[PDB]
Amino acid sequence: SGFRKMAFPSGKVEGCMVQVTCGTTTLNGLWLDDVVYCPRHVICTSEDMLNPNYEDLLIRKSNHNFLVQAGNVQLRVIGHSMQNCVLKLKVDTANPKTPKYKFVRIQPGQTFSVLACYNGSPSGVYQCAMRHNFTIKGSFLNGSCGSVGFNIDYDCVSFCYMHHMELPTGVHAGTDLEGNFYGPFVDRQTAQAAGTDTTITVNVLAWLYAAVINGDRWFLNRFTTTLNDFNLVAMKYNYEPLTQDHVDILGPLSAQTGIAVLDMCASLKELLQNGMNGRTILGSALLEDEFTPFDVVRQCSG
Amino acid sequence: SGFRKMAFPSGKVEGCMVQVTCGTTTLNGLWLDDVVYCPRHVICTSEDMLNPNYEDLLIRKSNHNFLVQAGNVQLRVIGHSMQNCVLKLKVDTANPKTPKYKFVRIQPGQTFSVLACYNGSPSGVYQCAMRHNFTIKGSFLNGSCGSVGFNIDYDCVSFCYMHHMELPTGVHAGTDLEGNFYGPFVDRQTAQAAGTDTTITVNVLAWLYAAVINGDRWFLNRFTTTLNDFNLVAMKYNYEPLTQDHVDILGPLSAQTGIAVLDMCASLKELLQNGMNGRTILGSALLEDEFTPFDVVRQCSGV
Numbered sequence: 001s002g003f004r005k006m007a008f009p010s011g012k013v014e015g016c017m018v019q020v021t022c023g024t025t026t027l028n029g030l031w032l033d034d035v036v037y038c039p040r041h042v043i044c045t046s047e048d049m050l051n052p053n054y055e056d057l058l059i060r061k062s063n064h065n066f067l068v069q070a071g072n073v074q075l076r077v078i079g080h081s082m083q084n085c086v087l088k089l090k091v092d093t094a095n096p097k098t099p100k101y102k103f104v105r106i107q108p109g110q111t112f113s114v115l116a117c118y119n120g121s122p123s124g125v126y127q128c129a130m131r132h133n134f135t136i137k138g139s140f141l142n143g144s145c146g147s148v149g150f151n152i153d154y155d156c157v158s159f160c161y162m163h164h165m166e167l168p169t170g171v172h173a174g175t176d177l178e179g180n181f182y183g184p185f186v187d188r189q190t191a192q193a194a195g196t197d198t199t200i201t202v203n204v205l206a207w208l209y210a211a212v213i214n215g216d217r218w219f220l221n222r223f224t225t226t227l228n229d230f231n232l233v234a235m236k237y238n239y240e241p242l243t244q245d246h247v248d249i250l251g252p253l254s255a256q257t258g259i260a261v262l263d264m265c266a267s268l269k270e271l272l273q274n275g276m277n278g279r280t281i282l283g284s285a286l287l288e289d290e291f292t293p294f295d296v297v298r299q300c301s302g
Numbered sequence: 303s304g305f306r307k308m309a310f311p312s313g314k315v316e317g318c319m320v321q322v323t324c325g326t327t328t329l330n331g332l333w334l335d336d337v338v339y340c341p342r343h344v345i346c347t348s349e350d351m352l353n354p355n356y357e358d359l360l361i362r363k364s365n366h367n368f369l370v371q372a373g374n375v376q377l378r379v380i381g382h383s384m385q386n387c388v389l390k391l392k393v394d395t396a397n398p399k400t401p402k403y404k405f406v407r408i409q410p411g412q413t414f415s416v417l418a419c420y421n422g423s424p425s426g427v428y429q430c431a432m433r434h435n436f437t438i439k440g441s442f443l444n445g446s447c448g449s450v451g452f453n454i455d456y457d458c459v460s461f462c463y464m465h466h467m468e469l470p471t472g473v474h475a476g477t478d479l480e481g482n483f484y485g486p487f488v489d490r491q492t493a494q495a496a497g498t499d500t501t502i503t504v505n506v507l508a509w510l511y512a513a514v515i516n517g518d519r520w521f522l523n524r525f526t527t528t529l530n531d532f533n534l535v536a537m538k539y540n541y542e543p544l545t546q547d548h549v550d551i552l553g554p555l556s557a558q559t560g561i562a563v564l565d566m567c568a569s570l571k572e573l574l575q576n577g578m579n580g581r582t583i584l585g586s587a588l589l590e591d592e593f594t595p596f597d598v599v600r601q602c603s604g605v
């Protein structure tokens with residue numbers, strides 16, 4: 001038993017991390033097959049980042065302007081192209097440690113593991129949930145750009161995030177591996193607003209099932225609710241509306257515990273209106289929305 | 303910026319995880335050079351675990367009774383020995399992925415990453431802190447025994463923990479890599495009590511420094527207390543007494559923020575005496591003692 005925020009084993013991703021330097025700017029790159037993917041602001045000087053014209057900046061660069069280092073060995077760049085906010089550097093050597101992979105675009109509420117890197121070297125691994133406003137609460141310092149987010153399904157690494165920036169609220173923003181930002185953000189050093197966040201309801205419910213599986217039951221009772229009436233309470237407390245699709249996704253956890261989804265919704269509705277009154281659920285004094293139903297099934301059944 | 307509970311990259315350890323089967327019991331082993339380390343209770347049937355005589359149970363096992371698998375490759379067992387609560391199986395092949403390593407015994411308050419494994423396959427990584435009563439709050443299911451805890455210092459993997467059991471309270475217990483349990487626990491299926499816990503004061507202070515480094519300053523106040531006065535408060539709220547050695551270990555964080563340890567102790571004194579009043583620090587509604595000063599320094603620099 002026990003319930004802990006857990007990251008995927010990072011080994012397969014560690015074998016893909018490289019260092020990319022363009023002039024005075026160094027960041028991380030992801031080496032898959034003969035291509036190194038990295039944030040395009042590697043071509044910027046400090047002043048360029050205030051209002052960069054990336055197409056003009058890239059025209060000024062040639063293959064020899066990109067220093068790519070895999071450990072202590074230099075990889076020769078033989079081609080370069082910009083795709084959205086990502087740079088693709090064709091190298092003359094295919095990564096012998098390339099795992100089976102795919103590039104995916106994730107949705108709000110979904111989680112992924114981040115392998116935080118500096119100078120092409122891995123420093124730590126932690127889990128992130130993509131917020132309703134397309135930001136993540138990570139841990140990223142200077143030089144962390146190009147660090148990636150991923151999920152692993154047995155032997156296949158699904159890359160979903162690449163780190164680009166930190167917003168004025170301390171939250172983090174980035175792109176998918178095709179260079180498209182999650183959210184309304186741009187890679188320019190200018191003040192940018194993230195939308196209002198909303199709590200990921202299906203995830204809070206998933207965590208309440210993880211708590212039940214671990215021995216917590218005080219929030220449980222014979223009360224129930226319609227989907228419509230729970231959604232009125234959800235709007236008041238800034239929670240996402242629960243849909244039949246979300247109820248369906250919670251089915252496996254509901255079957256495992258014998259507690260119907262709308263029965264757990266009645267419990268959640270009560271926790272928001274009445275509060276916890278001095279107690280902790282799974283070591284937390286707050287309701288947590290950073291775990292998906294799949295993250296819960298991963299630790300509470302298999 | 304941003305402060306997060308973080309595990310070490312696990313690649314080096316993933317390359318050492320194997321599956322160990324003895325009869326109907328399967329768990330994980332750690333393959334270093336030509337030796338596989340695993341919990342000795344792999345030799346037990348479910349009935350044996352209630353009151354095992356490990357010496358007699360092992361005498362009835364031969365090398366052929368142990369099946370060790372690395373991926374889909376059988377590693378032939380050519381020798382077996384028991385050291386405390388660990389079984390050491392000598393195999394016919396040296397692990398070509400053996401990293402540079404040490405076996406260390408950690409103290410309460412110290413942290414490590416656990417690479418949770420099932421059937422010799424790593425499934426997840428998370429950080430654990432060794433509590434004052436020598437237990438950890440982990441996430442371990444059936445077949446997780448043999449999963450290890452470790453710290454990485456650049457290229458060297460310091461293995462400090464091997465998982466063995468879960469206590470009636472839901473907390474977890476295990477041994478160092480020499481098979482000596484942390485705490486008063488024995489590897490027998492019998493109710494065992496963990497000590498009363500005490501909060502790790504120096505870790506709470508390190509986490510308050512992490513909070514200030516990340517813009518969380520509401521709890522900072524204009525007062526500076528003394529070590530003696532802080533210790534009067536700590537003994538009332540079940541916190542460890544702060545020592546000069548602990549103040550010394552906090553030096554780098556105190557220097558990086560320009561906030562003296564006794565200025566931060568006055569913030570902690572006020573948080574304990576007045577409570578957090580429903581307010582949060584680094585997203586938490588509770589004071590956290592799961593981070594060492596080294597974890598805060600390592601993370602806030604980007605080692």
Ligand SMILES: *C(=N)[C@H](C[C@@H]1CCNC1=O)NC(=O)[C@@H]1[C@@H]2[C@H](CN1C(=O)[C@@H](NC(=O)C(F)(F)F)C(C)(C)C)C2(C)C
Pocket residue numbers: 027041049140141142143144145146163164165166167168172186187188189190191192303
């Ligand atoms: C990439 N290595 C860094 C990662 C940043 C550094 C501090 N924390 C992080 O996560 N990315 C940047 O420095 C990007 C980069 C220029 C500016 N920048 C920012 O993240 C800045 N933020 C913004 O300007 C904002 F708010 F719009 F997101 C900074 C003020 C430095 C935090 C570019 C090209 C966006």
Ligand SMILES: *C(=N)[C@H](C[C@@H]1CCNC1=O)NC(=O)[C@@H]1[C@@H]2[C@H](CN1C(=O)[C@@H](NC(=O)C(F)(F)F)C(C)(C)C)C2(C)C
Pocket residue numbers: 001329343351442443444445446447448466467468469470474488489490491492493494
């Ligand atoms: C090894 N794979 C498991 C890991 C356990 C399974 C559930 N969560 C865990 O951490 N270890 C065991 O099954 C050990 C093993 C016999 C019994 N045991 C326990 O963890 C039991 N606990 C105890 O008897 C206690 F309280 F003393 F710790 C159990 C009731 C199954 C949780 C031996 C040899 C200790």
